[PDB]
Amino acid sequence: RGKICTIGIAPWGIVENQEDLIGRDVVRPYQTMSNPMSKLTVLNSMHSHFILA
Amino acid sequence: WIERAFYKRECVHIIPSTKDPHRCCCGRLIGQHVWSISKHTQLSPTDA
Amino acid sequence: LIENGVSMHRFLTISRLEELYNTRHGPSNTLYHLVRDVKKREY
Numbered sequence: 562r563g564k565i566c567t568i569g570i571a572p573w574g575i576v577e578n579q580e581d582l583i584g585r586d587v588v589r590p591y592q593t594m595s596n597p598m599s600k601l602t603v604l605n606s607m608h609s610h611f612i613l614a
Numbered sequence: 615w616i617e618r619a620f621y622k623r624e625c626v627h628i629i630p631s632t633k634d635p636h637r638c639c640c641g642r643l644i645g646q647h648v649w650s651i652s653k654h655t656q657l658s659p660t661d662a
Numbered sequence: 663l664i665e666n667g668v669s670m671h672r673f674l675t676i677s678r679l680e681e682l683y684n685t686r687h688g689p690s691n692t693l694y695h696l697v698r699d700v701k702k703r704e705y
Contacts, residue, residue, distance in 0.1 A: 613662060
């Protein structure tokens with residue numbers, strides 16, 4: 562049963578690749594390649610919904 | 615309708631220094647800069 | 663390989679798929695028979 566409807570309230574600046582998320586109504590793929598030295602923390606991939614505060 | 619109802623913002627004015635000249639209080643770099651408390655953020659429609 | 667990341671459309675070109683249609687370094691294929699037969703219709 563994998564429609565859990567989870568929502569992730571993450572800050573807009575805390576997430577990684579802010580330039581990747583630029584674009585209106587555009588399917589922008591994000592890779593789960595985690596950089597160990599970046600302060601921009603990676604996303605959690607299998608969340609269904611996201612809110613960028 | 616979602617873009618015309620929900621707005622983003624981006625502090626770009628003032629640009630202070632916090633123990634480093636590139637390190638703004640708004641988090642971005644000094645060259646990267648293009649609440650309003652000591653940030654002077656500007657409201658704009660959301661592009662994300 | 664896709665579990666780390668491949669992003670398959672970036673993995674493809676015309677030429678990469680084309681060499682993949684010609685090499686036989688594995689399972690046997692019947693393309694040698696078929697493309698000879700349809701160029702007999704193109705002969």
